[PDB]
Amino acid sequence: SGEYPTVNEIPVGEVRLYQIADGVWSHIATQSFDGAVYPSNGLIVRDGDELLLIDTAWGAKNTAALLAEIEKQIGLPVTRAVSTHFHDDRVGGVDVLRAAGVATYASPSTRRLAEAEGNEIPTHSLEGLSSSGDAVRFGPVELFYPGAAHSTDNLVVYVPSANVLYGGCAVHELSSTSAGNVADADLAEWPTSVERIQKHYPEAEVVIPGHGLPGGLDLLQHTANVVKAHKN
């Protein structure tokens, strides 16, 4: 009823949308992995009379439910999707998107990692993002490669019209007490990558983590803090 949705409100298989700003929504879904249930976020950005999707809803059936929820709540076609790294909470559902006529994109680094791991593979390669600090435009967003953090390929997304920073899994929510699933992370580089985000996007007004509650710029420093304490 207006608060940011959580698992307790999200059975696995259902998707909720949350209005972040004019023409910007997050999507929230839940999934089981290794016997525990997790929420995860993605982004939807209005692109004229079409929509740009950032990240799947973590699974094929969740992603089908996402498309149905978008039709119900927004009613504009999703034409393109970008996956911000290679894990199943970002690419699981790309086959559903592709069969629904959505053009799917990711960096070559994400595509290679997805392929090697056996995850779903976005169709199109996003060049221009291979060095830390790189940025490119993609419809109504800027894509930014901050360097290795949660994964070596993680991208962040900025919505300039609304000063919305979508950190993806490189950014954690304020209530977090650990740095999430760090199996593919670079804990030593992560703070430097966060510092690059902070320098590049100092006017961000909303910061959205890959999992959990949006907040403000404090999510960035908090993420560095939890990662440094994990490493140590």
Measured from the CB atom, is 40 or 107 closer to ligand YR8?
40
Measured from the CB atom, is 107 or 176 closer to ligand YR8?
176
Tokens representing 189 are: 């580089």
> Which stretches of the chain bind Zn ion, using CB under 5 A?
87, 89, 169, 210
Distance CA 163, CA 157 (A): 10
User: What secondary structure does DSSP assign to 2-44, as a single string?
Assistant: -SPP-GGG--TT-EEEEEEETTEEEEEEEEEETTEEEEEEEEE
Residue 85: active-site member:
yes
The site string for ligand YR8 over 37-76 (x = CB under 6 A, - otherwise) reads -x--------------------------------------
177: number of Cβ within 10 Å = 8
Contact with ligand YR8 (CB under 6 A) among 59, 140, 180, 215 = 180
The site string for ligand YR8 over 202-221 (x = CB under 6 A, - otherwise) reads --------xxx---------
Residues contacting 208, CB < 8 A, separation 6+: 20, 26, 41, 43, 164, 165, 166, 167, 171, 214
Q: Which residue has the tokens 């740095």?
A: 179
Residues 151 to 170: which contact ligand YR8 by CB under 6 A?
A: 169
Residues near ligand YR8, by CB under 6 A: 33, 38, 87-89, 150, 169, 172, 176-178, 180-181, 183-184, 210-212
